[PDB]
């Protein structure tokens, strides 16, 4: 029975020598013996809002998902395949769910390292199933179908919302299965779940500049739905593709011992 | 939202409809 729960639940008061009956964990049931029943309580009107634990609020933060510097005088630009698996902070927070449905939201933020020049950038989103530019100046950059976006450096950062791209109803975060239909296709990759390929170049023709452009791509996913939560991954990662596990040499977060030790259980 | 598309809108932080029972009591 679903019910709107805007605040955390209230506590009714409680009442000598009462005799409660029984319990069962082994059916798979979390025990719902109330704090009213097991111990003495009092009336608490509870006003703690549950809103910040919502699955929207838990994931709709603009995490930096890429930080790629390129030198201007791939070389001369960068193309980046979209995954949230880049940085381990956001991925573990997304490995808490099996199926995720969200609309992404890219915010490209550009700086210039070493009179600092003003340039115009192009951030073309090439979804998978199209052609990404190999060279800096292919004819793929003026492809009028791909949702390109032009933006300067000295202006607020460019920002575009990319919709839910998958042909399934949700991105399979984990994927117990194999891509394609042949036996050399890799494990844990769904071809359906690929977002696209965002690629950013500097539009200007070649300037005598001794300057480095550091580009940061942010992603605040929104309109988020989630399904089938998972145990959070405790061990350190070993790659972006597969969920291999190594463990550390000492506790905590080791293979033999996830929790750091103490003297004894009774000390 | 002044964009024509619907996913372009702001986030919808209004889904307060819980159901904790379907994990704690998935029984019949």
């Amino acid at each position: 029975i679903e019910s709107i729960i805007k605040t955390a639940t209230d506590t009714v008061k409680s009442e000598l020598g009462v005799v409660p009956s029984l319990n069962a964990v082994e059916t798979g049931a979390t025990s719902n013996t109330e704090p009213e029943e097991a111990i003495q309580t009092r009336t608490v009107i509870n006003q703690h809002g549950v809103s910040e634990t919502l699955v929207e609020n838990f994931l709709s933060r603009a995490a930096l998902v890429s930080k790629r510097s390129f030198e201007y005088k791939d070389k001369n630009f960068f193309k980046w395949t979209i995954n949230t698996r880049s940085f381990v902070q956001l991925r573990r927070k997304l490995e808490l769910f099996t199926y995720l449905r969200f609309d992404a939201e890219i915010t490209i933020l550009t700086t210039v390292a070493v009179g600092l020049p003003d340039l115009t950038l192009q951030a073309m989103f090439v979804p998978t199933g199209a052609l990404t530019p190999e060279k800096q100046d292919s004819f793929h950059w003026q492809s009028g179908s791909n949702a390109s976006v032009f933006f300067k450096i000295s202006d607020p950062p460019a920002r575009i919302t990319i919709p839910f791209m998958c042909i399934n109803s949700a991105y399979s975060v984990f994927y117990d299965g194999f891509a394609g239909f042949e036996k050399n296709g890799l494990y844990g990759i769904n071809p359906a779940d690929t977002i696209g390929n965002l690629c950013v170049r500097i539009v200007n023709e070649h300037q005598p500049v001794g300057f480095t452009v550091t580009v940061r791509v942010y992603m605040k996913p929104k309109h988020i739905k989630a399904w089938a939560p998972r145990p959070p991954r405790t061990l350190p990662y070993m790659s972006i593709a597969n969920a291999n596990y190594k463990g550390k040499e000492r506790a905590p977060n080791a293979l033999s011992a996830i929790i750091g030790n103490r003297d004894s259980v009774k000390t | 939202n002044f964009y024509k598309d619907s996913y372009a809108a702001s986030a919808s932080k209004q889904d307060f409809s819980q159901d904790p029972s379907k994990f704690t009591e998935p029984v019949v």
Partner: protein, 233 residues
């Protein structure tokens, strides 16, 4: 309070256990008309595949790490389910797993019967992805190599978030999990994708005074609400 699940032509003598687990609170049903994709009329066997495929009994000794079966990878050869899996382009089927363990009143032990959706396994210590003959096992069904982290770097200590039961050899001797269609797609490929993973891990190992103690675990999967599209041959 002895019982007899009669489903199809197959039948199992069971114990009446309380609270047969409907995973995520849902009994499995067929694909609704407003969610379908394949325009052709799917074949719906009602007693050919809907029957208790009971796998091999597995010897739980006092040092076992666990057993894992992937669905429907365990059933890709067995019976009329394997005569449709290997004759259709798609399938859609919930499952009804009855895991029964046969102990005395003297054996101690505890099992975690848990059904992990999309259990993307991991290979320990190597950056090579797990091979095709390391995931698909069939009627044999693999064995956990590091069950404490569920062979994927997660934690077994948190693994009760999945649809889980318990075989505590004091209390009960059988588990029952009823599985809905958990997938992002209405139908999927019956040789390329495993939705669930029946994981049985001994939390507390087996024990009695004879230290050569072995107890067999019986596992029986029945597919509920089978559907198939794309009939070749």
């Amino acid at each position: 309070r002895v019982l007899q699940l009669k489903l199809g032509n197959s039948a199992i003598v069971t114990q009446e256990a309380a609270n047969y687990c409907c995973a995520y609170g849902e009994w499995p049903n067929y694909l609704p008309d407003h969610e379908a994709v394949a325009i052709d009329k799917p074949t719906q066997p009602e007693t050919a595949t809907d029957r208790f495929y009971t796998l091999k009994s597995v010897k739980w000794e006092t040092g076992s790490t666990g057993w894992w079966w992937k669905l429907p990878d365990a059933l890709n050869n067995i019976g009329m389910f394997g005569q449709n899996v290997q004759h259709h382009y798609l399938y859609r089927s919930g499952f009804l797993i009855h895991v029964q363990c046969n102990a005395t009143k003297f054996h101690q032990g505890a099992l975690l019967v848990v059904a992990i959706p999309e259990h993307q396994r991991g290979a320990h210590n190597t950056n090579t992805s797990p091979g095709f003959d390391d995931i698909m096992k069939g009627e044999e069904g693999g064995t956990f190599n590091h069950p404490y982290v569920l062979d994927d770097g997660t934690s077994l200590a948190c693994a009760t978030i999945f649809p889980h039961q318990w075989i505590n050899l004091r209390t009960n001797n059988s588990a029952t999990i009823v599985l809905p269609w958990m997938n992002a797609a209405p139908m999927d490929f019956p040789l390329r994708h495993n939705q669930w993973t029946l994981a049985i891990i001994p939390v507390v190992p087996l024990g009695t005074r004879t230290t050569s103690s072995m107890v067999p675990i019986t596992v029986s999967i029945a597919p509920m609400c089978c559907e198939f599209n794309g009939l070749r041959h």
